[PDB]
Amino acid sequence: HMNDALHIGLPPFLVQANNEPRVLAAPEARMGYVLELVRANIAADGGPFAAAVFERDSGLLIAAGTNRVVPGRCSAAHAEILALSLAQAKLDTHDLSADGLPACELVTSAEPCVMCFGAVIWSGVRSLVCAARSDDVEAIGFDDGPRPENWMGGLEARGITVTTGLLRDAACALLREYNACN
């Protein structure tokens, strides 16, 4: 709580993720790093979800986010919202497709909820890469909410390419561990 701002603090691992230079060229290298943030997040009292904004072609890491809903007292503090918002703050624009910016990609541990679906559309990212599916997320009692018919087509029609199931099995291993062992 602050008089004069909405302020979501980041746990140490996530401050480090957002300030340590990191270039990950391969799609699986990007998603592997996002899954490292999942496990660090769970250890830091957060939900089993992480995402990062990368420059699409180089794989330069711009920003990372994790679920901070409960410790942050903020239902909007999904991984995707934090990653997109922190990337925008770093690049000084609400619009990651502004002229001069390199094309940006959101790499996410799970397919977005209806709120984060909207956030992706507003953000200016040109690519979304997901590991776990809505079905995998719903099957451990998280709720994607009423996502419109053909949410993938909705993103694709707006110039946002969608890839799903990348390291899904590894993402499912961490989700199942969260369900059992947490």
Added chain:
Amino acid sequence: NDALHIGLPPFLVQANNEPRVLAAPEARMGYVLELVRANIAADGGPFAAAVFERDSGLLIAAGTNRVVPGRCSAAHAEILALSLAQAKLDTHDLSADGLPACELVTSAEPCVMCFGAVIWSGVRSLVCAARSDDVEAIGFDDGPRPENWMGGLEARGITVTTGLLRDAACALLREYNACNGVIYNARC
């Protein structure tokens, strides 16, 4: 570099600091539309929202669109109002045990992002002024909201009212389009 930090302009800090009780829907929405006009004057978009105690009218928090000045595409009025209400009441869930029922009063029907945010927030009531068609007829974009989003909220025990002070909300959207241009116009 260690936080998501969305700064609030002074008028919005003022709005979040002063105790205020507005019983009637029209009183609540009247105050939300004052914040629309103040926000336009502070380089923001023509959108504002506030969380109230549904049954007492006590204001809990207000938000405005700070997308462009705040360099944050998530900084929609609804996201700021719901999040600031959560920070103030110290919970992610505005329906947590012991909290009064909360109401989001918004200058326009929520985009698909904000629709999802309303579902997760714990508010039990949504009250809107401008319709989605009003906002999209004047060049804005609410994005692909699911079929019967109002039915979707009502089925989750979130009551929906729309069109409240729609005429004043439309007047602000139209006055904003007029002055929304690079050529200096001292009238603005």
